[PDB]
């Protein structure tokens, strides 16, 4: 029911249901992003590492727009004899998010079987009966096979194979969205940006990097061919407005405006950009916050290290929950984010100093 | 009272009082370093990332001299309702150094208001009344404002804004200095070097890098434009001669000579350089130690990773205390350090092998 | 910038920079208080114990006005061989306030050398690496001397010698002050009172007692020669409006009005005085709080024990932080405190019952 048509409910479905580590047998997301973007951009290319490169042409400096598409997942490492799986996580995940339903196993493109991962048996002790946290060894997964032989006949093998099985639903039918955030909300901004951008006052290069959540320098490889002389990023990591907390996290997210990054673990944004975006949002009546973290590793950090020594600002689409399971967002912020970047790109020609 | 005129008491004042994260609204240190160095060097330039580049010209290999100017500081993240600030640290700091006086808030260049940060209230418990260590959440800061509105009318906003408010005083009027060490003692060597260097037997490039204490690869960006075929560094991290300790830390500092780095966490210095400097100090009767750490991240590590694969040695001006609050040094070592590098640079032409 | 001329910024400088244990070689504060007060009072005397006695003459009962001038400090107890000092505290101090800058050593009057005291090395253990609280043995101090011999040649000897090195700065240029509180804010009220008092309706005796923070009965000695038949006090000890706390401490200080003491550890104020001051502040539109503690030892307790059995009220100038390091105050309260006492003294003649 697109009362406003601000965020296309159909488009978000295509990207987010797709599996979130590319180049593997799951690589369909690559096709998806290029299947959309290419009609609005002059040319597009794929690097060796699974990165995607979209080059709109123009007159001006080279701007780099970075989003990550490496959604968290899990990896099978071996097959116990009873036909039940153990697993090893990809970096970033918290194991308390074991399951409530339906872990999906992507044997190959267009072939998925449902799986569950509920319980490593807690050890036998009385203080540990109170510690219902899972053991660190890691949790196990079930696909219902009785034996190792049956499991391999399905197609399960060792490899990075698994993901979370999200589906996109609407909460707060006034406005909010459930799982639209991690590793593709930024891309929706990018795609919406490409539709909204007509007059290229600066020659932009949209990238959608891989291996962000593990080895964030995955993004860096794309950078050198593309970046020089400016840079941007759209990644996120938040602890947002969870009740029972003090006010010191509340300003990170209140359900309002977009989030500019001044500081993270990795990156210290060149502050002229920040003050400029601050100026920009006020001129066009755009909402904005100023967010900082104590931790987290973003794409922007890898951009800062290319040989030119690039100055970088970063936007953030806020309001995540612990990024495994559900990933709430705000319809207002994402469309506002698009507006902001759209104007910044065109007005970048004056920013140069 | 410069009885010896070995270390100019006036010059050190200018650099160290200045605020220690550049590019921000505090960026005055940039002007300071170039305001001095430029009269003695042929040409000077500023990179995009806030790095400073001073290029003396000559006949020989390209030598790179690296010091950091990113003194530790703190960042406001939000504003509680009572007009009191919370904070988030920049990497490296220890929070037991909360305050004894006067945290300074650099709203903008030439505008500072004093602030205090003494106490997060310890939790209500009896073993914790004994644990007077601050909670890890982080400490809070006061500027005396009663409300959020009053605070923003001053000029306080979210951002990296704060520093420590050091001032330079003389202890052991025979010889020592109080806060002259961190993030500018190396620069004083550099500046003194530029005055002492007349005949450029090798074409040197003095850099003063930013974002060392966080994302040490901040220095790397300058490297590629400048470095090739040799490298040096002047950074420090020490646990020095604190009483009640064994002798295993005492050799790290005794109040004598300069410190050559063989090993750190990050960098393993190309040992030919080390043996050469060892040879050099003996030839000119210079004092020297040999220091190693188990931890710490220096500029030298980032130098080793540029594409040529550069060999690197590193000098250290010793005798720090836990780098937040007071930062004792030895007048003897710093002048000796200058002598050593001065001779090494000119004699580098024979080092090539 | 005395926009109001309510609190003289010059006067506070003289008292508070001075060293805060008298009779020692530091005793200059004694001269300071008498150098000011004597022009406005008929006569002044010094007792044997370092107490100061100022006797304005009049017609009425004998009123005693007590402030303490024994600011906290530290004492050297021995000299380790490496030229570094250990210390022993004076009562009241918390050792988590080790240093952030510049501990001052008063060898003698007008001779000071700066010192630092940062770190006792924490013991070697893993739960203790988390306990960054200092060991109770006590912290150590550095003055940069290499040996015991060098230290004594400076003038350092065993004795109570050390203080905190505060300096007075203005925060909240609308209104607040940094280190003006402990052991001399009360005296500024006293001095301001003496200027404001013209017509002595009761013969008052202003005292400035020593050895309050240790052996609070230090004040008592002055009492017997002076006190009989009434008594007052201006001392403080507070835990004030620190964020993250409940409301149960907030009324102790909110940045408003002065603080009357009903109860402490030591003293239970004769409540007729309290109700009278309550009545008084309402008649002249003066602001007031009512504050009580669970702990702390004030001058008033010692007054209650003189042979007559004196009834005593006590005023408090609020808003301290943990009294070692910074000592915030409110310009409004201190001037209001002066007004209150000024009127109470003259109207004491009706209070007698
Ligand atoms: Zn991570
Ligand atoms: Zn992420
Ligand atoms: Zn570090
Ligand atoms: Zn450092
Ligand atoms: Zn006490
Ligand atoms: Zn006290």
Numbering used by the authors:
A (entry chain A), B (entry chain J), C (entry chain L): 1 to 353
Provide the authors' own sentences about this structure as they appear in the paper.
Nonetheless, at 4.1 Å resolution, significantly better than the average of EM maps deposited over the last years, our EM data set is insufficient for de novo structure determination, highlighting the challenges that many EM data sets encounter. In step 3, a real-space structure refinement was applied in the XPLOR-NIH software, using the full Coulombic potential map, first at 8 Å, then at 6 Å and lastly at 4.1 Å resolution, and all NMR restraints, calculating the full dodecamer. We additionally explored a refinement with phenix.real_space_refine29 to refine these structures furthermore, and obtained an even slightly higher structure accuracy. In the general case, validation may comprise consistency checks against independent NMR data that have been left out from the calculation, or correlation with the EM map. In the case of TET2, a crystal structure was available, and the refined dodecameric structure is in excellent agreement with the crystal structure and the EM map. Possibly, interactions between residues in neighboring loops (residues 127–131) found to be in proximity in the EM map might stabilize the loop conformation, leading to a reduced but still visible density at cryogenic temperatures.
We apply the integrated NMR/EM approach to the dodecameric 12 × 39 kDa (468 kDa) large aminopeptidase enzyme TET2 from Pyrococcus horikoshii which forms a large hollow lumen encapsulating 12 peptidase active sites. The dodecameric assembly forms a tetrahedral structure with ca. 12 Å wide openings, one on each of the four tetrahedron faces, providing access to the ca. 50 Å wide catalytic lumen. NMR and EM thus provided structural information about TET2 on very different length scales, but neither of the two techniques by themselves allowed to determine the structure at the atomic scale, owing to the lack of long-range distance information in NMR, and the inability to build a robust model from the EM map.
